[PDB]
Symmetry: C3
Subunit: 172 residues, 3 copies
Amino acid sequence: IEKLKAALPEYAKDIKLNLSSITRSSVLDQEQLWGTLLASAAATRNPQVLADIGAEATDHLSAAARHAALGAAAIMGMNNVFYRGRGFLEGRYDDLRPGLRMNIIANPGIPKANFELWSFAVSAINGCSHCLVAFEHTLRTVGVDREAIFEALKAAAIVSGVAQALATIEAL
Amino acid sequence: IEKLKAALPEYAKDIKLNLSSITRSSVLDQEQLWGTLLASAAATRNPQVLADIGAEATDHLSAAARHAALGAAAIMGMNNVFYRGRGFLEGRYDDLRPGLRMNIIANPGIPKANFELWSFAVSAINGCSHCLVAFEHTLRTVGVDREAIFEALKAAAIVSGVAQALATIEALS
Amino acid sequence: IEKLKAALPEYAKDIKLNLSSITRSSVLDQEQLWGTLLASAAATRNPQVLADIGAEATDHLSAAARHAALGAAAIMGMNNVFYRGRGFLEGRYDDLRPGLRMNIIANPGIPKANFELWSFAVSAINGCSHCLVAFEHTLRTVGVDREAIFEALKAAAIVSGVAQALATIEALSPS
């Protein structure tokens, strides 16, 4: 959304430019791109960026993709804490059954590699290498190019800065 | 947590299902459990999740544990940043006195165990290995089931998922 | 400061006491200290704390300082996600040309060492060792004793506790 780029402060000049460039990515297909932007937007917790990106994503994303993306952010919202936490514990708790329902990862109602690309994205924002690596591994295993994986990473980061540049406006 | 559950979107079904079960756990006593949910809810910093959960954690906790649960999230909001950053600095800042008051760690109106448990839960949410690791160690030495510690970790992550999902609908509805 | 401080919960007295002491410290410049407090306050994403800290920052910092300090939180919000990500992928992508605009870092409207200290502080908040470690290395190089660097870290943690404590009262405040 142009309204999103325009809300950005002058001292967040690079963010705006990175945002504009990422919106024009030739590395990812439309669903992969916008789903990453939308899933990333959700993980920033910034309602502003989610609204605009969500609004902009409506003509690149079917209702299915849109939902699965938000769903990605929600499930990773749980997974990035559990796995990361278990990951800091050296394995000591690996023998226990998590007992966490996470079916959406099994059937996201949309092509798998996309939901993974988006979980990868969110996992990067929340900062859980355990989930980031597993997905980055599955992505390569299913044939997603390194270039595309990197783009999603870039997309996750640009959107984090965007959200952050916005929140910084709370100083009139 | 009746309010939250119904608020959750169907694309967040797994979160819904997970919330409703964690609230019915029986591996952690009423104090250990609700303190975790509360300290967890606070640490997610989602007004909604904290309210609902808080409004219910009340008829499960003495006023001492509540304050303690809430203060655990708050103090660790500081500690988790200081200890992590210091941890990343090649040990070059290990001999310095932090000059950070944290009398609350000298524990509140409750026994150092639940609080250690709640600080554990908050550290997982904040992503601080140093603190997470230390509390897990201290919790065992004290005689706390690894399955309980494990349950606190799940409750923390679940609550995080609730926060994330709820923050989304409230920004799109 | 007094307002924010006064607004904090009874279960956050250490935070209150730490905010107060950190604000009245003398290890860092007035520009170093308030640039850090604001960069930090911004990194917590709490509207109230940014507003209160952003307010008082007007009489301790110059507009440029504040712009650049908020800009540090902004670019670090991107970089901290990127480099940490690369970190988890064990450098497997260190050879793909990030292609991300930054510049501000090379040309802040203020002395670099201060922008670095603030970036260092923000990185501490977001949790990116790569950036933290990197800004740390540069700081020490051009001076700034570990005493100064250590203070900013402290400040970031304290402002981090503030946000958390404030957020729970606002959310738990009657009706």
